[PDB]
Symmetry: D2
Subunit: 448 residues, 4 copies
Amino acid sequence: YRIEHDTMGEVRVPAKALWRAQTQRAVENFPISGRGLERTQIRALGLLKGACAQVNSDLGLLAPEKADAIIAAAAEIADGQHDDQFPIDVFQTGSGTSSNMNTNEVIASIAAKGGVTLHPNDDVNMSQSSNDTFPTATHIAATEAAVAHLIPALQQLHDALAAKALDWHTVVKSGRTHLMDAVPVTLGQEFSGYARQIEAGIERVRACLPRLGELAIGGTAVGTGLNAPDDFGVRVVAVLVAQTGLSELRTAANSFEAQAARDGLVEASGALRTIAVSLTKIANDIRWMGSGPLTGLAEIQLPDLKVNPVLPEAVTQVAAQVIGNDAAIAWGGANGAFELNVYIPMMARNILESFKLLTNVSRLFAQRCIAGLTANVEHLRRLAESSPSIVTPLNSAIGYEEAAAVAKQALKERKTIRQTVIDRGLIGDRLSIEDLDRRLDVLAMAKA
Amino acid sequence: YRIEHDTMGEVRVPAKALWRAQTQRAVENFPISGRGLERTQIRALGLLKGACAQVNSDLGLLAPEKADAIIAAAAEIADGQHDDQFPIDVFQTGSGTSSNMNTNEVIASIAAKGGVTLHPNDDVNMSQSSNDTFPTATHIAATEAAVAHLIPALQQLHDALAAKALDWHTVVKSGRTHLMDAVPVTLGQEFSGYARQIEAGIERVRACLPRLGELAIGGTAVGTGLNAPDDFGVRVVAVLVAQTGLSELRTAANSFEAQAARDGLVEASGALRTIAVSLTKIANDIRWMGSGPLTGLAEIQLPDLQKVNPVLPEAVTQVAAQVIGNDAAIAWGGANGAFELNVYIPMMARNILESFKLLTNVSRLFAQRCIAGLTANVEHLRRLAESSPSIVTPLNSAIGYEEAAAVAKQALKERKTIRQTVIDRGLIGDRLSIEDLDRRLDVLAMAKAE
Amino acid sequence: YRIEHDTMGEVRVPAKALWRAQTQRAVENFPISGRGLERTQIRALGLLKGACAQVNSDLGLLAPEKADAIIAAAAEIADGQHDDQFPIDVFQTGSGTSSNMNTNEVIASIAAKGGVTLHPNDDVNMSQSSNDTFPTATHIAATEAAVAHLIPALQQLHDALAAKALDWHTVVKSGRTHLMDAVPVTLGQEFSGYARQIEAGIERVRACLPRLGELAIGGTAVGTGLNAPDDFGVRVVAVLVAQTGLSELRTAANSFEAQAARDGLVEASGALRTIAVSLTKIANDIRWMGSGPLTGLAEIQLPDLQPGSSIMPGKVNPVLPEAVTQVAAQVIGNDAAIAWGGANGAFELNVYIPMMARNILESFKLLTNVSRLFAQRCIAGLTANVEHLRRLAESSPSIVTPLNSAIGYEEAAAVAKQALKERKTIRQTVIDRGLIGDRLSIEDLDRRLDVLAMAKAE
Amino acid sequence: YRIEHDTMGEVRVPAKALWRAQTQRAVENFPISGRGLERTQIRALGLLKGACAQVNSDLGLLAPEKADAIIAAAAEIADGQHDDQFPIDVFQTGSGTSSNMNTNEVIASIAAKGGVTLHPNDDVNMSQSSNDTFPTATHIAATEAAVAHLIPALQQLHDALAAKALDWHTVVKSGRTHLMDAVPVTLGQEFSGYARQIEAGIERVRACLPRLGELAIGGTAVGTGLNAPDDFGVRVVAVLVAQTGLSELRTAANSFEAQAARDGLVEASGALRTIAVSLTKIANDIRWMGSGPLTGLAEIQLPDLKVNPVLPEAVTQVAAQVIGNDAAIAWGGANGAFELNVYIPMMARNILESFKLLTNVSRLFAQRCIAGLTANVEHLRRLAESSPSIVTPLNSAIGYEEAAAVAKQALKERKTIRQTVIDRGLIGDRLSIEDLDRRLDVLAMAKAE
Ligand SMILES: COc1ccc(S(=O)(=O)N2CCCCCCC2)cc1NC(=O)Cc1n[nH]c(=O)c2ccccc12
Ligand SMILES: COc1ccc(S(=O)(=O)N2CCCCCCC2)cc1NC(=O)Cc1n[nH]c(=O)c2ccccc12
Ligand SMILES: [Mg+2]
Ligand SMILES: [Mg+2]
């Protein structure tokens, strides 16, 4: 319940709080959602402030005692020790300056406990602006989410689907097109399709990384780098790559584009949206395959967590959320003006949530649904044995003309190809029953 | 770190948790977002369980000591005393069964501390199913959010915009179409338009209430009411109306439509999305009018909250973007129901209830901390209106369109009023008196304000 | 070809073209989509110009011979006689001024063929501006599309679904929740739900009309009505209402809101988007119910409309549910474009009107046409597989609950387990476990396991 | 009318139409939008039918005389001689069955004029299904639109923006953040940012081509390739690459994914949506720069088509349409079932429209707006030199309090910062003229030379 002094009056701040007057003013200004920055965003702000202090110390602009104090305080923030010291709403000034100042104030308070006096702006914000910091922290967090978390979760799900594609390679069943009975396929072939969708999703995320990983740091207020060293960005990026192991981080190709727009977030959200579209098809097919057991398809059994398909439901709900988040991201992305896009906090919340939801639900889907599925093999074969057949595989035995007459008579009389052959008296020296049954065999028709 | 024995083995539950084994299993099943139900959600689940116990008591199905214990526990939940006892992810089974069971378990644990044993399922879930309760609670929460919170916040913003319209009635300035200079308006007329956008917003929310207030309660598992009293729904709705004062709550017109779809939430999100569209235009015009102080429009000054940056217009346009995204998620969930149940309810509820909250909170902040304190550069706005080439048309009948165009070009080049330019070019004479000039160039008259 | 002279220079225009130099310039300026105004928008521009000429005549501002020529020409345009004379891209100047000028030029050319000289701007655009005309025509077209076309088409679909709800009142089947077996319902109850969705859709459209029907006419360039009669809007609206019978048309509540924003189109699109969401659920349930017919649900049969496949010649597909679900996807896309344009107005004018108009009027048209086709070519001819549906209901573990009070919940679970294992009815499994006796008579068993009574039909 | 027939019986068809019974049933079943396939789609179906007949001929499955007749008729269709013979609505059966049969029937009728009897299904549809042909035609049309049309249009717009970036490299002006005055930039720097957004757009389109160019051909009804030669897809793709020169066309990595989903269209629409987002920012900044001529920013003048910013308005309306189309595409993409995604005609309409609108508006914007912009150079510099934002580098010489008084007086008197520092008598005690001109050099402050 302490009291601090701002250039517009008094400011009451909780006693255990490491934040100062500017953060408290932002708390009072933006009571909108009641939610603040996520752990990933706080970590990236800590990483960035430590790297900037490191580079300011290397260039001789910041006394080594002050840099050491910022570096140690920043490492605690990056390590998750101060996730309760960031109370500002997501829906704040659209540069994210409020959160940038929150980080400067918390580092100054941590340093003061260790006996060092730091000015939040002149020391902790040295060579930085109110406008190049929060977007840099956003792109660090998004690139870490893509590379360290989403891609491995998607690979786990790909591997689970591919393992079923191989197990079920000869588990024949009926194909369905337009929801209507079609020629045979295998359950393994369908899973090979699901696995390719997830592999393509990993390709889509990898394709966005050259632009997602672009950082604005060094551009300062408008992109020109005024009041920063000319090589500030390239030096800070090198420290961040070294500390995180994220080789995908890079300086911006164009310092104006990197601050006037957040196009890299819009691009990345489109990859995540495409993954949500793929996951919707996979999850829907799996719940339909497990439907019933008397009123539905009853092709597979899902693991029980009459089992309701609770992980397909979680997957499809997550996909809906990614689709909505993606619309919010593109709306903010389009609406920048001149030197700055002022939708960064909202865009950051949405893209980081989409990464988190897809990573977590993919791992759960892989481990607690896909890996445990069991096929109802005898039921699936009975469905394959009820698919339509074709005459083509009889051509070499009865010739193009008799085959065509079998096709026509089967259609007219609503008979199978097999029975129409028997009924036309075609079993003989040209065609044994055995040869009929081998030519029309449903696993052979699946071409597995 | 207390222990519990489930149907399927052992479960460890935190010591001070009031939830039980089925909630803890859902915590383990759905570690997806790390975000659970919001306060409004949780309150409505308490309201619903209290009303259900009241009705089961009234019908002689539930012993009164048990009903009384449920009603007392449910009132604590409705009063927001147990918002920390609902740990299940939003991204759970799509009926919201897990959160329904979370409510039943917390009520049983609260009751147990007052010395009354309740079975979560057989007592707290009596006459209810796993499918008619969560969407009922969602529609209670959304109807309360609309009536009690968003409409009053929009009315505050409307009244702030209308007050500025009246204060700025005669504040004449150049009109802008296509971003280019146009004939005069007043700042008051522009604010009267903003006020109408917000008043139409309230009309849009009021128009969705007949269907937003429809509750599925009493439909049970598939909408038929099997295993519930025939009049359970109308009885529970009547208790909710009596307790809350929300007369907009009603039984559903069709019990199958009320469980197979969530179309009322999709409809209400469309009203919220329209309000977000209106707020985007109002907030964008206000930040543009405050742009400068040298190279921008410099029409008005915003109050300084943090040369003021337009931080509340930025909060408002960010909220609007979130409402538009949330709206897309809601419609996606709404379209994808199957047969007797739409299984996107927890995701739809998160998104609709967030949209109500953000619009309510940001509308009040925008009204109080931005709109109320705007100041206009009155004399500057009038000087620009009086200096615009757009106002030479009323001279054409005195001096011709060719001389009126030379006046417009010289006024702009020399940074002079049209009036001073007409005088400087020696046009005052028999053709045009000083008084006829001041009548033809009366920019406030050109704006046609009441 | 024939040549004309614009303020800029010389312009070549097609011989049979009733448009003039401004329209030809717009043709050369915006070769973007290769699609121009639809017939509903052209019709509305004709209605508007005819009403404006009538009022300008009544007020003594326009000579009667000139007003009479504009009225005659504008009636030809409203009657669809000139739908080939509007070549300008949708993607034009955002006020729609190019299309307004196209209308003025075509009316002047029609009048010229009857010996009357009309100035496109000073006569045909009298009392109007480049900014209050196109949004007025857009709202006339959208209101007409809602009231005269979509609501009747939705009522037709509602009536077709409600007729099935009555025909199938006793057709008992298992319910499905989460795609899993549930307690009994009737196919009539499910169709009653579909019907309510469409009835609610009509209520949604009706709820938006007080604001969709607001017209900007009379507000002129900025909303102030400068250079128009003070009562131009109310007089033009009176003529349009009398001539069209569109009682929903009204003068805007606020003349600045009606030009600075297009919020009524955003609102109306939300109703259409909600109808698309409802239609998606209805169409998806119907194609699933008709799936198979050997490997699917096979609950109903859809009328056959065309061959499905050359490789599998017997196969017929649910083509009308597919058309419906594809229309719904288009309406949801159109809705997103409309809200995008609606948010992005500046000051006195929203300059997204041609794009918003294209999208809202297309959503009306697609929903109207597909609703009628779905009602007539799919719903009306559905047939139910009654005995299949009842067999599954009578075999369902879900229906053992009503036995609990006779034999207890544990023995009822054993009946469920055995029946499901042995593919038997519940009735027959109860017998095969000799539970009929003192506790349970055979008439009593048949009363407890009455699956139609469990559906609780009214 | 004349009588034609199919497996469902007899159908009345317009006496002279080149389509037959299946197309006519589709005319009556789907009168929804009143719009059919676009020129690009009809071209792709013609290309594909010709390539299929070449491969069936090469494998000895189809008589050379019949293959020649198909190839010639398919060439007339691809060239646009028979577009009026494709009457079927976009909103047809979701596999594109109806438009596939339309192509087969029209080819058979054209071949008959030349005295060759072709069966639309046994000959023109040999080794094919609608399930692999209609999505193949859609991905051909989309790949061609990306490579031959949109990337060159974007490169023209990039080059026009980059030409301004160079021309305006020293055109110093006030920076704007939050719409508020900020430290100096140049118009050239802002245009270099717009140019980067369009170059990144080109990178985004190129990044999607490995998947957009995947073709389903050879997968037949369910992806298994039943009723087609095992190498049909690889042979047909080789013919298409030879004929079109589109090396980006390729056989699908997985034949089941290529028919059960249209994820490549969803992916490509995301690139187009991102370009729409970039174009919105560029066009909105340009119309604001041109605003006025008295009460707006008045930084630049747009070419006249007091000019209204009509091409910025066309660009921002096109962008809105691409965003809407992108939502419709993703909705269709998610909703496939089992072996087939049945939203292909609607997804094809939307993604091909987005390609076309972005191509056409990008070239118009480049040639008829960007190329002709003029800057109010001396005005922009005067405002930059008069902004309170540039007083900061004086703080160390005159103090915060006096730098604030300089800013306030400069704004009130409408004078430069340089002239205000002189007027307040700060030269000599605080700093010299040499020092003043170094500290307030706005072009140096923009970090431009
Ligand atoms: C954001 O627009 C402005 C911002 C600040 C100022 S000001 O007060 O600070 N100041 C600037 C010049 C130095 C001192 C003289 C007084 C005018 C003027 C302006 N507009 C204008 O100067 C408008 C204008 N008028 N006439 C022209 O021929 C013209 C040509 C090109 C561009 C615009 C125009
Ligand atoms: C769109 O902004 C403008 C447009 C046109 C003009 S102008 O050249 O045509 N002309 C305007 C009318 C008076 C004639 C003398 C010169 C200024 C100026 C401006 N801006 C300004 O005057 C900027 C400005 N400077 N200083 C102030 O204390 C002030 C206070 C309130 C608002 C703005 C300011
Ligand atoms: Mg690496
Ligand atoms: Mg079955």
